[PDB]
Design an enzyme around this catalytic site. Structure first.
Site, PDB file in Angstrom:
ATOM      1  N   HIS A 165      52.578  34.631  45.426  1.00 38.15           N
ATOM      2  CA  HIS A 165      52.350  35.272  46.501  1.00 38.15           C
ATOM      3  C   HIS A 165      50.953  34.640  47.274  1.00 38.15           C
ATOM      4  O   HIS A 165      50.397  33.802  46.715  1.00 38.15           O
ATOM      5  CB  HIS A 165      52.163  36.710  46.176  1.00 38.15           C
TER       6      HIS A 165
ATOM      7  N   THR B  57      45.381  40.126  44.963  1.00 39.20           N
ATOM      8  CA  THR B  57      45.253  41.178  44.194  1.00 39.20           C
ATOM      9  C   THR B  57      43.826  41.937  44.681  1.00 39.20           C
ATOM     10  O   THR B  57      43.712  42.865  45.030  1.00 39.20           O
ATOM     11  CB  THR B  57      44.917  40.788  42.758  1.00 39.20           C
TER      12      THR B  57
HETATM   13  N1  LIG Z   1      39.602  44.289  38.141  1.00 42.10           N
HETATM   14  C1  LIG Z   1      40.046  43.096  37.856  1.00 42.10           C
HETATM   15  N2  LIG Z   1      39.091  42.316  37.463  1.00 42.10           N
HETATM   16  C2  LIG Z   1      39.335  40.941  36.970  1.00 42.10           C
HETATM   17  N3  LIG Z   1      40.523  40.629  36.909  1.00 42.10           N
HETATM   18  C3  LIG Z   1      41.387  41.420  37.259  1.00 42.10           C
HETATM   19  C4  LIG Z   1      41.170  42.713  37.560  1.00 42.10           C
HETATM   20  N4  LIG Z   1      42.621  43.285  37.944  1.00 42.10           N
HETATM   21  C5  LIG Z   1      43.366  42.294  37.895  1.00 42.10           C
HETATM   22  N5  LIG Z   1      42.755  41.257  37.149  1.00 42.10           N
HETATM   23  C6  LIG Z   1      43.354  39.991  36.906  1.00 42.10           C
HETATM   24  O1  LIG Z   1      44.092  39.447  38.156  1.00 42.10           O
HETATM   25  C7  LIG Z   1      45.732  39.163  37.691  1.00 42.10           C
HETATM   26  C8  LIG Z   1      46.243  39.444  39.150  1.00 42.10           C
HETATM   27  O2  LIG Z   1      46.018  38.405  40.048  1.00 42.10           O
HETATM   28  P1  LIG Z   1      47.286  37.582  40.825  1.00 42.10           P
HETATM   29  O3  LIG Z   1      47.936  36.502  40.002  1.00 42.10           O
HETATM   30  O4  LIG Z   1      46.420  36.933  42.107  1.00 42.10           O
HETATM   31  O5  LIG Z   1      48.022  38.977  41.420  1.00 42.10           O
HETATM   32  C9  LIG Z   1      45.860  40.081  36.672  1.00 42.10           C
HETATM   33  O6  LIG Z   1      46.716  39.458  35.774  1.00 42.10           O
HETATM   34  C10 LIG Z   1      44.507  39.924  35.993  1.00 42.10           C
HETATM   35  O7  LIG Z   1      44.202  39.093  34.961  1.00 42.10           O
HETATM   36 ZN   LIG Z   2      48.185  41.184  42.451  1.00 41.52          ZN
HETATM   37 ZN   LIG Z   3      49.771  37.561  41.104  1.00 45.44          ZN
END
Ligand SMILES: Nc1ncnc2c1ncn2[C@@H]1O[C@H](COP(=O)(O)O)[C@@H](O)[C@H]1O
Ligand SMILES: [Zn+2]
Ligand SMILES: [Zn+2]
Ligand SMILES: *[C@@H]1O[C@H](CO)[C@@H](O[C@@H]2O[C@H](CO)[C@@H](O[C@@H]3O[C@H](CO)[C@@H](O)[C@H](O[C@@H]4O[C@H](CO)[C@@H](O)[C@H](O)[C@@H]4O)[C@@H]3O)[C@H](O)[C@H]2NC(C)=O)[C@H](O)[C@H]1NC(C)=O
Ligand SMILES: *[C@@H]1O[C@H](CO)[C@@H](O[C@@H]2O[C@H](CO)[C@@H](O[C@H]3O[C@H](CO)[C@@H](O)[C@H](O)[C@@H]3O)[C@H](O)[C@H]2NC(C)=O)[C@H](O)[C@H]1NC(C)=O
Ligand SMILES: *[C@@H]1O[C@H](CO)[C@@H](O[C@@H]2O[C@H](CO)[C@@H](O)[C@H](O)[C@H]2NC(C)=O)[C@H](O)[C@H]1NC(C)=O
Ligand SMILES: *[C@@H]1O[C@H](CO)[C@@H](O)[C@H](O)[C@H]1NC(C)=O
Ligand SMILES: *[C@@H]1O[C@H](CO)[C@@H](O)[C@H](O)[C@H]1NC(C)=O
Ligand SMILES: [Ca+2]
Length: 817
Positions: free
Chosen positions: A431, A152
């Site tokens: 992922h 992300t």
């Molecule tokens: N701007 C942000 N700041 C902090 N945490 C975030 C932000 N955007 C998304 N997230 C977190 O990152 C997760 C996605 O990360 P991932 O599991 O690697 O896809 C989301 O479910 C949120 O909990």
């Molecule tokens: Zn993501």
């Molecule tokens: Zn994720």
């Protein structure tokens, strides 16, 4: 008397009741919940609510007066006045924008659906009417390639900077910086520390050129970057319901023009959340996909109500895809290392290894030791240890000190941890894998005045999107890793016309010099017909040269963009070359293999002919390499290939067509030229080849300066020699195999940046046939022509008739098999 319409919470005489006590007594009117309670919890009108008596606790109104008071539910007009919703209207072209004053440049909204893998739209399009309509009416790619690792924070920050993570500093959701001696996390206070965030996010670019920004969540948008926040921003809070995010952005689009943004972001955690929790193929992901489709529909209905639906440029995007994890596809390092306590291993498919004792041992630690310890331990191993500089260059994943010196390359569906304690549920969706894996590919839909209508564009990279958004906002882009103009084919009216980069110094001349035939120490095979009169065989008629130039440089010669550099053209009958006096080596050869050309099996080892056009040097002699254990040599233009005879091409044995080459790499090089090049030539009805050395000792994906290269020469048999870090190959044929590489309407390209290593431990060559592993190594190390251009300082195809933007499109392409 049978309905609650108009009487919510009033006492009744006649049968059914409309007060909270009715529920327990089971004597509520049939429509009590829909009329009186639901409106506190929903953002929609429905047939129960049309002409409702206004409720004080309702989130939005469906009352007759809701337009006078301007708080109608977004779908009011569609449900209560029988008008068509945005999705119900047929596509119509937006050639001129219809924008209010202040939007002479129309706004751009960047709308992210986290973990929306491209495949979700390929398979479930029938269940996703809104996103399907944006695809149909707009500009779509079946696959947008994310950045490695496919996570992300790296991908979101890459989209808004145009930078590889190695350059923008956000290399994962969790990092350690040794220079800061600090750890980065999304749930930590360090997330708000500006030291992590490098480059220039588009909202900063926009601010410096006088456009305001409104971000409803985006990585970096709640951080002070170059002293700047977006004009409107939100502190990240995943609990905020999606409807409230969309309604807030619709409020911002109604601000007066003095405070109203031009650049907007919208971010939803779905379908990433459901993908992790339930897997990418699940009831829960289908429901989450329909929910986000509905949220996109709510935005489009909102924009239509505001008459901005033929004004705003929408980019619907995702950060990465999603894969099904398995407890049976998880590698535990403790199996190979034991329960050691000196290392910290970042788990998942983008696994990295670091000493526990940091920052002290961070650079001093024995990475190569563990790297060798974990190599080729089982046959068909599903993970591979890599020192970061040995990872395929296409990943651009080494430059930053925040990238652990030891990384792991995982096969599709496979993950890695130290032990089962130091990882989450192994059966979850995940992922982070290689950005060319199918299931990691992302969503891209562009819709609005700026974008073409009903176009399906070839796969492009999310790093190209910053330049595109700059073009949509009439901004000058900051320096970034996008090729400006490569996405001009997505735009109705491109604002940037790219030009081929201009060659700095024109080519120096290498004239023949009368000199004695010196002894090179060669035991040439007797079959080979030497060069008896050099001056005779290399005094070519202008007529003869035109023929050779047309056959060997059908696209023009590679041009050199390096500043302090002195190159000369060397002509030969089967190939041309750019020779560096500065590094005693060709920077590039160019030749063309025809369908019915002969490849000799005859030996040509320990055979060289002197080139009287350059001063003879000890490193150009067979004697320097004879039983030399430290380095050998190889030919750029292959001696195996004859066009006039069936023997060996003697002119390819010139001292000017050789490069230093490790004995181990010769296996790869020999297999390519003996076997593969033959197969490629037959399959594609001819193939133009450009090959050359690569010097990237900085592992930054750029050609090293001459200055820096002087200090990287090795001393071998008391000579100073420069050994390439990599070798590049660029194959060019025609899309139409009826035509040959000299007469293509459209170019089909395939490029490689092969690592130049002293062993073949990467390929695990033990009880395997030669054929298999070489092709696999080439595929893993394929590259964009743009990747080759950056790392060699060369520029190809400058004489093609096509517009520059179409060539940039070609150069940024990465093949998928
Ligand atoms: N701007 C942000 N700041 C902090 N945490 C975030 C932000 N955007 C998304 N997230 C977190 O990152 C997760 C996605 O990360 P991932 O599991 O690697 O896809 C989301 O479910 C949120 O909990
Ligand atoms: Zn993501
Ligand atoms: Zn994720
Ligand atoms: C992706 O695109 C990136 C953005 O252009 C690009 O990264 C840039 O890389 C160059 C060189 O690697 C950096 O430019 C300067 O390099 C010179 C040469 O050493 C330095 O003089 C200069 O440093 C400066 O001088 C002082 C020394 O620290 C310092 O105090 C000054 O403030 C100044 O930094 C630079 O280092 C440039 O900074 C990079 N930009 C960013 C944002 O990273 C990548 O090359 C490109 N990637 C690929 C693979 O093409
Ligand atoms: C993160 O977002 C959360 C959801 O948007 C949010 O939770 C909600 O907090 C509000 C606070 O305003 C609560 O609403 C309460 O506000 C009214 C008027 O001030 C009060 O009279 C009532 O007590 C009413 O409940 C919500 O209860 C609550 N919603 C949910 C779903 O939990 C958090 O506050 C946000 N976090 C941060 C960091 O601001
Ligand atoms: C680098 O960071 C580590 C982690 O915070 C520091 O180590 C700690 O030192 C403090 C007192 O200075 C102790 O109270 C902690 O228990 C230590 N933590 C750990 C996990 O060891 C270290 O001092 C920092 N600085 C340098 C440059 O080494
Ligand atoms: C790798 O090193 C570990 C110690 O970390 C040891 O347990 C193991 O025997 C080694 N494996 C080999 C020699 O491949
Ligand atoms: C030296 O090279 C020759 C061929 O040039 C080879 O036949 C021989 O095996 C090599 N000698 C040693 C010492 O390995
Ligand atoms: Ca470099």
């Amino acid at each position: 008397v049978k309905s609650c319409k108009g009487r919510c919470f009033e006492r009744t005489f006649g049968n059914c009741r409309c007060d909270a006590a009715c529920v327990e007594l089971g004597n509520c009117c049939l429509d009590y919940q829909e009329t009186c309670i639901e409106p506190e919890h929903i953002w929609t009108c429905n047939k129960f609510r049309c002409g409702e008596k206004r409720l004080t606790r309702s989130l939005c109104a469906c009352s007759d007066d809701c337009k006078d008071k301007g708080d109608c539910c977004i779908n009011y007009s569609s449900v209560c006045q029988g008008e068509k919703s945005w999705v119900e209207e047929p596509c119509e072209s937006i050639n001129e924008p219809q924008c209010p004053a202040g939007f002479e440049t129309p706004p751009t909204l960047l709308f992210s659906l986290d973990g929306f893998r491209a495949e979700y739209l390929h398979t479930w399009g029938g269940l996703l009417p809104v996103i399907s309509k944006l695809k149909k009416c707009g500009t779509y790619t079946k696959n947008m390639r994310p950045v490695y690792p496919t996570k992300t924070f790296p991908n979101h920050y890459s989209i808004v900077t145009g930078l590889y993570p190695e350059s923008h500093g956000i290399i994962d959701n969790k990092m350690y910086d040794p220079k800061m001696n600090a750890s980065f996390s999304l749930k930590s206070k360090e997330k708000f520390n500006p030291e992590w965030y490098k480059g220039e996010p588009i909202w900063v670019t926009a601010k410096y050129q006088g456009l305001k920004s409104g971000t409803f969540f985006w990585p970096g948008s709640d951080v002070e970057i170059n002293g700047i926040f977006p004009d409107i921003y939100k502190m990240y809070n995943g609990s905020v319901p999606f409807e409230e995010r969309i309604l807030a952005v619709l409020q911002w689009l109604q601000l007066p023009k003095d405070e109203r943004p031009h650049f907007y972001t919208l971010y939803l955690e779905e379908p990433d959340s459901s993908g992790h929790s339930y897997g990418p193929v699940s009831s829960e992901v289908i429901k989450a996909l329909q929910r986000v489709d509905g949220m996109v529909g709510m935005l489009m209905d909102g924009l239509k109500e505001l008459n901005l639906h033929r004004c705003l440029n929408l980019i619907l995007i995702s950060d990465h895809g999603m894969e099904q994890g398995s407890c049976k596809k998880y590698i535990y390092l403790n199996k190979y290392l034991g329960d050691v306590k000196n290392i910290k291993v970042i788990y998942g498919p983008a696994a990295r290894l670091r000493p526990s004792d940091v920052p002290d041992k961070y650079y001093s630690f024995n990475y190569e030791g563990i790297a060798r310890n974990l190599s080729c331990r089982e046959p068909n191993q599903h993970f591979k240890p890599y020192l970061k500089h040995f990872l395929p260059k296409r990943l651009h994943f080494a430059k930053s000190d925040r990238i652990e010196p030891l990384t792991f390359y995982l096969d599709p569906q496979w993950q890695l941890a130290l032990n089962p304690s130091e990882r989450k549920y192994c059966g979850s969706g995940f992922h982070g894998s290689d950005n060319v894996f199918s299931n990691m590919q992302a969503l891209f839909v562009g819709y609005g005045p700026g974008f073409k209508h009903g176009i399906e564009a070839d796969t492009f990279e999310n790093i190209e999107v910053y330049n595109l958004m700059c073009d949509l906002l009439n901004l000058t882009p900051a320096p970034n890793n996008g090729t400006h103009g490569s996405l001009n084919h997505l735009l109705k009216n491109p604002v940037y016309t790219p030009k081929h980069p201009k060659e700095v110094h024109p080519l120096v001349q290498c004239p023949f010099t009368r000199n004695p035939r010196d002894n090179l120490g060669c035991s040439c095979n007797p079959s080979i017909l030497p060069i008896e009169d050099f001056q005779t065989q290399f005094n070519l008629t202008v007529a003869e040269e035109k023929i050779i130039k047309h056959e060997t440089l059908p696209y023009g010669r590679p041009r050199v963009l390096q500043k302090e550099n002195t190159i000369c053209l060397l002509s030969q009958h089967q190939f041309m070359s750019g020779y560096s006096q500065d590094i005693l080596m060709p920077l590039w050869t160019s030749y063309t293999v025809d369908r019915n050309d002969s490849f000799s099996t005859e030996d040509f080892s320990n055979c060289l002919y002197q080139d009287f056009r350059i001063p003879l040097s000890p490193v150009h002699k067979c004697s320097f390499y004879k039983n030399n254990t430290k380095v050998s040599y190889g030919f750029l233009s292959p001696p195996q290939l004859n066009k006039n005879s069936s023997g060996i091409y003697s002119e390819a044995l010139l001292t000017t067509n050789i490069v230093p080459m490790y004995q181990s790499f010769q296996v790869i090089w020999r297999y390519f030229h003996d076997t593969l090049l033959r197969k490629y030539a037959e399959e594609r009805n001819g193939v133009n080849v450009v090959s050359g050395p690569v010097f990237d000792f900085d592992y930054d994906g750029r050609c090293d300066s001459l200055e820096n290269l002087r200090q990287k020469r090795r001393v071998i048999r008391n000579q100073e020699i420069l050994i390439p870090t990599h070798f590049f190959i660029v194959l060019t044929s025609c899309k139409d195999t009826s035509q040959t590489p000299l007469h293509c309407e459209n170019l089909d390209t395939l490029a490689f940046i092969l690592p130049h290593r002293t062993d073949n431990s990467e390929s695990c060559v033990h009880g395997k046939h030669d054929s298999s592993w070489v092709e696999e190594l080439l595929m893993l190390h394929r590259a964009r022509i743009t990747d080759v251009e950056h790392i060699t300082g060369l520029s190809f195809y400058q004489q093609r008739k096509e517009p520059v933007s179409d060539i940039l499109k070609l150069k940024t392409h990465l093949p998928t098999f």
